[PDB]
Amino acid sequence: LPVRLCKEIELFHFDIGPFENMWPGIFVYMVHRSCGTSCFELEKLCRFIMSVKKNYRRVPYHNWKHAVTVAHCMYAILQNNHTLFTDLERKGLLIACLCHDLDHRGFSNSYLQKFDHPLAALYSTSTMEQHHFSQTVSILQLEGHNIFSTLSSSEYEQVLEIIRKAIIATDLALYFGNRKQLEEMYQTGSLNLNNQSHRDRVIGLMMTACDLCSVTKLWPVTKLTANDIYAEFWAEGDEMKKLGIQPIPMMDRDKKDEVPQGQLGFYNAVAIPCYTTLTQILPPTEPLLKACRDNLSQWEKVIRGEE
Ligand SMILES: CCCNc1nc(C2CC2)nc(Cl)c1C
Numbered sequence: 157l158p159v160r161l162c163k164e165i166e167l168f169h170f171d172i173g174p175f176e177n178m179w180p181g182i183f184v185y186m187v188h189r190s191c192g193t194s195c196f197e198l199e200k201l202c203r204f205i206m207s208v209k210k211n212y213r214r215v216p217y218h219n220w221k222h223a224v225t226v227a228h229c230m231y232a233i234l235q236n237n238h239t240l241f242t243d244l245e246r247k248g249l250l251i252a253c254l255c256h257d258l259d260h261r262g263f264s265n266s267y268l269q270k271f272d273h274p275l276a277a278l279y280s281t282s283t284m285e286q287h288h289f290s291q292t293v294s295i296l297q298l299e300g301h302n303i304f305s306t307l308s309s310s311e312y313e314q315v316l317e318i319i320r321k322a323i324i325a326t327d328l329a330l331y332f333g334n335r336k337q338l339e340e341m342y343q344t345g346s347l348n349l350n351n352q353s354h355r356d357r358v359i360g361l362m363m364t365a366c367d368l369c370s371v372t373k374l375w376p377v378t379k380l381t382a383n384d385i386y387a388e389f390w391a392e393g394d395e396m397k398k399l400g401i402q403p404i405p406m407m408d409r410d411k412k413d414e415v416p417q418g419q420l421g422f423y424n425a426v427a428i429p430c431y432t433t434l435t436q437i438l439p440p441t442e443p444l445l446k447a448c449r450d451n452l453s454q455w456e457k458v459i460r461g462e463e
């Protein structure tokens with residue numbers, strides 16, 4: 157990792173994209189700058205990182221690159237909101253982010269529930285999210301992978317609960333209600349970060365903010381990531397067609413023209429409210445909202461023909 161990266165990595169808009177070979181090392185650095193060099197035993201941490209990477213499939217979007225990008229956004233939020241979180245939450249959230257899409261197979265919760273896949277019989281709601289957490293626990297259970305071994309049985313349970321709620325929160329179906337609740341608590345002046353239920357909701361919104369952070373990068377980066385997002389959705393659509401089912405337009409590769417309009421709908425219904433609410437609760441996260449608005453403007457320009 158070069159000396160030029162050390163200061164860039166602190167910024168919310170930082171793109172890990174051009175530094176693939178350095179991704180494991182970038183994650184270690186973020187952990188060290190967040191909870192110290194003695195936060196985890198370096199040998200166990202590397203073993204855990206490398207096993208997490210191998211357990212992310214070669215799919216167009218929910219892959220290793222997405223995991224590190226999400227972890228980096230969490231790091232930027234934590235760095236700009238220091239004193240707010242405990243050592244356990246700092247540790248827990250960075251791990252949750254790296255593991256939030258573990259073993260994703262390129263299929264949505266919609267597909268798995270519609271085609272009655274065994275994962276949907278096991279987990280009726282937040283299907284893949286319940287699987288991602290189960291995979292995180294399995295990796296921790298492996299020999300020489302328990303990074304939380306030094307913690308007491310009480311601290312271990314706490315951090316696994318932090319991780320569990322954080323991973324489940326990445327289910328976008330749960331985001332709508334979470335954000336409406338947080339906006340209510342904030343507007344009425346009842347929001348209290350000392351209150352555990354309020355704290356869990358804030359962490360949940362932080363998770364959504366990180367998960368969707370490709371919409372907060374510089375326009376060239378945001379656009380290339382959207383291409384990977386649609387390549388994965390189109391592959392699911394192709395599978396649906398083979399099963400005699402017409403996919404939704406977003407998952408249909410023959411309905412490409414609808415993408416800029418779909419992005420506009422996504423930013424207005426999901427991304428803008430997410431970062432607007434996050435900015436209200438955590439004022440230093442304002443650059444994420446500003447970057448999201450800039451990308452919304454770029455999508456409007458694509459629709460108007462100025463692509
Ligand atoms: C499963 C990925 C969830 N994330 C996103 N989903 C969409 C859908 C196409 C409208 N757009 C964006 Cl930009 C993101 C980040």
Ligand SMILES: [Mg+2]
Pocket residue numbers: 256257284326327
């Ligand atoms: Mg996910």
Ligand SMILES: [Zn+2]
Pocket residue numbers: 222226256257326367
């Ligand atoms: Zn994700």
